[PDB]
């Protein structure tokens, strides 16, 4: 399990979604991803998690209406095709090739800052992008009181990793208590299902020796 894979929950990290520790050990074989991609500002988020003491997961409770939320692949494989356990690959309807302009928001009711993570999908080609999330220019915005940033997918061919030439870009912000995060998106979104809270203090290391 990769230390960042605890946030997204790829199949390797199914047993580490809500761990709690004083000492966290990363191993050289840990991969944070199943569907190829990488975290923006990865090390800062790793440094945050190493001294986090653990992760508590609270459902964010997004409901989606009249789109496809079963996105899956045989790269993230648990039973058959699957995906990241904490997230959802939002596709378009089989009936209509449209992705409606959606607005989804979350309020952090808790006393600790919330680790919100999400992905932006870079399809292999515009053909692939239009087939999954519908035609037209795709746009994803993220906003809070502190944080604001907007994202547009960059379709194109990437080197094969686990059979896929596409890439998912994972982004994250930290909601302060009582603040609100809002997602506008009409496609190319990997929405969070659950948020993440830090359990305490700990120390992370990197090693390859017996415990």
């Amino acid at each position, epitope marked *: 399990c990769g230390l960042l894979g605890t946030i997204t929950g790829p199949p390797q990290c199914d047993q580490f979604l809500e761990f709690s520790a004083d000492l966290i050990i990363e191993r050289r074989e840990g991969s944070d991803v199943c569907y190829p991609g990488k975290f923006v500002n990865e090390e800062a988020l790793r440094q945050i998690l190493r001294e986090s003491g653990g992760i508590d997961k609270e459902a964010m409770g997004f409901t989606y209406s009249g789109i496809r939320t079963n*996105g*899956a*692949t*045989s*790269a993230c*494989r648990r039973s*058959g*095709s699957s995906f990241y356990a904490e997230m959802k690959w939002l*596709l*378009s*309807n*089989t*009936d*209509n*090739a449209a992705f409606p302009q959606m607005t989804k928001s979350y309020k952090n009711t808790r006393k600790s800052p919330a680790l919100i993570v999400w992905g932006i999908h870079h399809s292999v080609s515009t*053909a*692939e992008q*239009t*087939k*999954l999330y519908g*035609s037209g220019n795709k746009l994803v915005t993220v906003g809070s009181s502190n944080y604001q940033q907007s994202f547009v997918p960059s379709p194109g061919a990437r080197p*094969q990793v686990n*059979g896929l030439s596409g890439r998912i870009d994972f982004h994250w912000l930290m909601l302060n208590p009582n603040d609100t995060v809002t997602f506008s998106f009409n496609g190319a979104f990997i929405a969070p299902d659950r948020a993440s809270f830090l359990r305490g203090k700990s120390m992370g290391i990197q090693s390859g020796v017996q415990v």
Partner: antibody
Amino acid sequence: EVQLVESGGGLVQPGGSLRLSCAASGFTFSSYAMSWVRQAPGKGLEWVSAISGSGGSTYYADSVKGRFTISRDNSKNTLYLQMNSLRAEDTAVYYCAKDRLLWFGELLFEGFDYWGQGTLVTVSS
Amino acid sequence: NFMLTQPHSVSESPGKTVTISCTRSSGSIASNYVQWYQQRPGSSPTTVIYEDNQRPSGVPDRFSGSIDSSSNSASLTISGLKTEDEADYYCQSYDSSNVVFGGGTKLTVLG
């Protein structure tokens, strides 16, 4: 040059078995999923089953599920299809078709790009 | 799943231009990729279109792919027919784990 070749076609009394084997060459066989397509004598195409590059995931069509078992050996660059409890309906010509992806059965199927020459399996008493 | 519907018979004169349509019963046509295979009698099928419009290397530029989301149809189109284009043309598309084949279309060059 990619080339596929099927062998094992014959005549079988209904209720019998037959193990078809497609032979692959000219591409990296382990990294491309494979599939079996059949064509009744004078009818359209009908996809039968498919198997991933690794060989772990195996996907069958409804009409043949449970009676057909697909398998592969990545070392022998060979494909297989075990046909059991055969019927008159299953009499057709069977092609092995190289899939364009590594994985089969995920959200998007780009078709096939190469087709073996075919083999005739005939089932009648 | 769903079913695809092509005409059984299409005919035209050499050098003219045909279109073979393929209509999908359920689900949009632009929700997955469509192929076009061709089968000259006595030979295995070969693929003349993939991803709804793309020609494999070695397919004459007279073949084109198309997708009409209004009619929920995918349409092959052959310009300047030759005598060697006489074959059967199957369209193909995809669903959850299901591979749907069209009925087949007999393309005749009027002699």
